[PDB]
Amino acid sequence: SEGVSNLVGLPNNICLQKTSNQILKPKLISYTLPVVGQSGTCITDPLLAMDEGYFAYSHLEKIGSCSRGVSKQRIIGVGEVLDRGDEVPSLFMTNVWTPSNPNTVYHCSAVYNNEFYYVLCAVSVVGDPILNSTYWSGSLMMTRLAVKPKNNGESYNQHQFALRNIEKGKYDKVMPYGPSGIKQGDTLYFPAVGFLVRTEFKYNDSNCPIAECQYSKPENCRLSMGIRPNSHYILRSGLLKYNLSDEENSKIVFIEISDQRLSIGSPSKIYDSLGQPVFYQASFSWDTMIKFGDVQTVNPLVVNWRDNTVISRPGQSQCPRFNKCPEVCWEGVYNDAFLIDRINWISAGVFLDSNQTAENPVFTVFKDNEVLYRAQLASEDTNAQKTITNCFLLKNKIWCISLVEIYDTGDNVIRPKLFAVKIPEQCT
Amino acid sequence: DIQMTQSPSSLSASVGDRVTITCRASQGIIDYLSWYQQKPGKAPKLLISTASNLESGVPSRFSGSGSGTEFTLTISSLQPEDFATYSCLQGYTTPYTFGQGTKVEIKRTVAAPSVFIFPPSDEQLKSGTASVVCLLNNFYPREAKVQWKVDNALQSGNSQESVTEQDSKDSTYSLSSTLTLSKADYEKHKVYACEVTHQGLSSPVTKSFNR
Amino acid sequence: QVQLQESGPGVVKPSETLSLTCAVSGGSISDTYRWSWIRQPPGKGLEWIGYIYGSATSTYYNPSLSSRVTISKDMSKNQFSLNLNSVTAADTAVYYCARDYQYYYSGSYPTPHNWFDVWGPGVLVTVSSASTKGPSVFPLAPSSKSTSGGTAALGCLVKDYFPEPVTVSWNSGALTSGVHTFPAVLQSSGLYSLSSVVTVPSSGLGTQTYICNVNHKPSNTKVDKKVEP
Ligand SMILES: *[C@@H]1O[C@H](CO[C@@H]2O[C@@H](C)[C@@H](O)[C@@H](O)[C@@H]2O)[C@@H](O[C@@H]2O[C@H](CO)[C@@H](O[C@@H]3O[C@H](CO)[C@@H](O)[C@H](O[C@H]4O[C@H](CO)[C@@H](O)[C@H](O)[C@@H]4O)[C@@H]3O)[C@H](O)[C@H]2NC(C)=O)[C@H](O)[C@H]1NC(C)=O
Ligand SMILES: *[C@@H]1O[C@H](CO[C@@H]2O[C@@H](C)[C@@H](O)[C@@H](O)[C@@H]2O)[C@@H](O[C@@H]2O[C@H](CO)[C@@H](O[C@@H]3O[C@H](CO)[C@@H](O)[C@H](O)[C@@H]3O)[C@H](O)[C@H]2NC(C)=O)[C@H](O)[C@H]1NC(C)=O
Ligand SMILES: *[C@@H]1O[C@H](CO)[C@@H](O[C@@H]2O[C@H](CO)[C@@H](O[C@@H]3O[C@H](CO)[C@@H](O)[C@H](O)[C@@H]3O)[C@H](O)[C@H]2NC(C)=O)[C@H](O)[C@H]1NC(C)=O
Ligand SMILES: *[C@@H]1O[C@H](CO)[C@@H](O)[C@H](O)[C@H]1NC(C)=O
Missing domain, CATH: 2.60.40.10 (Immunoglobulins)
Known part of the structure; x- marks a missing residue:
């Protein structure tokens, strides 16, 4: 055995009962992927993607403080997900690529297809494209890493494509902006975002939902559609589509998201669960409550957002946790969820249990209006920021792996941590 | 709000000394401490941002460190110019909070008052x-x-x-x-x-x- | 070069509403994200009152004051205002206009580091049922008693003014060496008692001319008092 499969079919029963018992028992599993191990350098900008018993990983290592440090290394790797022997899954890396200049690579994203990962990624000499947006050249790079490297074989193991032809429509720029994507047949879909000049953004403020929000003004979401109300651009999430069956390697197409539940363009994720794609979008604006759901159509993109009333994200100012009313802000965090059962929608993710600060990461199995069960991944006072969760099967048992950026209690340096959590069957 | 307990409230060191003011946070503010200097009848001047970063044009003798809950500003060689009430600003969660301030005074010798x-x-x-x-x-x-x-x-x-x-x-x-x-x-x-x-x-x- | 300036009454009656207005010169309010008002009570730590969005209607107030505080803006003038109702004597303080700076490192990490990069000079507001009153200025005339043979000290006694805020300058700013203006402590009458002295060479008396140049903002006063042996 020792083989990891995607969640498909009727997995072994999980606990469907809301409980307080400490039935979730996480495993720290980051020791077989030793890339993370470090002593005080800051590791940031994490990427974990899993598909079909393989995975993609990435981080950026900066010398100095996590916020003003200097980029030292960019690592983009791929490997296999296997049972280490005790019926616990763990990541083992097979192929690593180090970009020549770390200061050019931003906002990578990964999609698996037929024994390769493709990591679409943004190239910028002006800085972070989101922060210095009007000057970003707009260029994109496509790396392709083989999950099964072959000895003395080049252009199979690693291959770089320059995307000359970008179909952007009305947008000036498009960009990978999310960890994970899906494959459908021969075509790859990356979570992406588009930069649209605000004065070309057609919106009626009569469409802003100010119901039960006395203190909210109708322009608010029209304004909060960019990082500042002034912003030359607004951001709109969607997908970057890449058809491998296309003759040339140049063309990549943008697909915008529906105007349902529109929220500022956010780090997003499209993934496969139990037979359909589910789409998640981070909340960086007034709609703090989690937004993710089944994908009715990938192109055009329309997402059946769950009316979740229990899961949210922290926010320091003007958009704290549990805010459902339109306001101008650009704050939040990427804590995604991954569906485990669709018959009853039960999903798993690591969320920060705080109103304002980014502390107390908690692994949480929940339905729309209720949280079935929790397990705290660190002390309640522990500061952590971003969580990426993916779930799969191991001997038909549902397992998740969550990457959690966690801060040292004494150092203030942050490092990614890898937890494996088995969803139990029994509620005792 | 997050309360900042700054200490010591007062201080006095000779020129050429090292001064250390420290400041703790009710909760964890990772890297979100600003260190300010204010001189009598003037506005505050920012010395340190993001815990350890000297702002441009501020002497190298000013230095800052942090553990997330304890934050220490160090003046490596006190100079006559550096006499002021120094303050904390936690810039993470809102309401923003300031330390209570500490008054750095300078010690001197052999001065006789002219009456x-x-x-x-x-x-x-x-x-x-x-x-x-x-x-x-x-x-x-x-x-x-x-x-x-x-x-x-x-x-x-x-x-x-x-x-x-x-x-x-x-x-x-x-x-x-x-x-x-x-x-x-x-x-x-x-x-x-x-x-x-x-x-x-x-x-x-x-x-x-x-x- | 962007600069702020506070304008306000200096004295507010107890139980009535305080108001202040900041004038922004050197740039438009619509260029910066958030602007804020913060205050410092005497002998006490800085407090943050709240912010107004630069180009949006949004406001956030410190919950110690949220019930009483209203922060408004006038874009046509580049002004923004503070209104703090039902003032207690606990609200005597120096009030600072200020603007906010946000540092970001990654566009997939919207957690700005906040601080304040530009400040006003600050205006003191006193919360007292008393009634304003301008100063009188009398020459602390130099004498044999105030002359050391190489150094002579002469001054101005500023007296019987409410409230405390006043400005002084020797020869209208040109004389700044050996000048000392003392911190007014509460005078027994309740008005404010400070002295203002300067040390000058004792062989330059009679030949040189010195002027007090006192100013009282709450009751408009521009004294130009002179001192002579
Ligand atoms: C973290 O934040 C949550 C909720 O987020 C915030 O909730 C609001 C208070 C407001 O700040 C929002 O903008 C923001 O998103 C806090 O949990 C909330 O706590 C309050 C007060 O404890 C609750 O309000 C109460 O709700 C009861 C029903 O659930 C209701 O019966 C109560 O009414 C009683 O009191 C009111 C006066 O307050 C009175 O009018 C009534 O007659 C009655 O006596 C009261 O309204 C919210 O429901 C809570 N919301 C949630 C989602 O749990 C949480 O406290 C905060 N954490 C910290 C540490 O501050
Ligand atoms: C991804 O791209 C593939 C291939 O597209 C190819 O790209 C060019 C470089 C050309 O050289 C062409 O060979 C081709 O367009 C798409 O697969 C192609 O899809 C089209 C439309 O679905 C198919 O057209 C069919 O035509 C036959 C005619 O006999 C009809 O019977 C069919 O009903 C249909 O109309 C075409 O056959 C197919 N080509 C191959 C090799 O499979 C694919 O659609 C695209 N995917 C996405 C998501 O865009
Ligand atoms: C956003 O990215 C663009 C990319 O070019 C930046 O434009 C240029 O950036 C430089 C450095 O920031 C500006 O300053 C110049 O620097 C050299 C020394 O390196 C100095 O000798 C020159 O005199 C000049 O000052 C340059 O003026 C600027 N050009 C323009 C047209 O703006 C831009 O600064 C970036 N902005 C932000 C906010 O990131
Ligand atoms: C706004 O309303 C007008 C009036 O019917 C309509 O023509 C326009 O398409 C609307 N715009 C959007 C974005 O809904």
């Missing part, structure tokens, strides 16, 4: 009261308490002090004493003196003789 007496104003006498003034000037320490032997009657509480800050060139204080009597009280004694107590060990006494 001056100012007789009542002739324009003030027509008004009603008389405010005899004495001036202690460019001296460390600040304590040069003034005793007025009004004539030869000892006076307590018929006079109040007013003491300047620490000067940024020579690190000396000044102190002004103002004795308010009435006009009628002023005329009869016709004898007024301010005595000074300082580290001069001469008990110097300056006199004034009405008209």
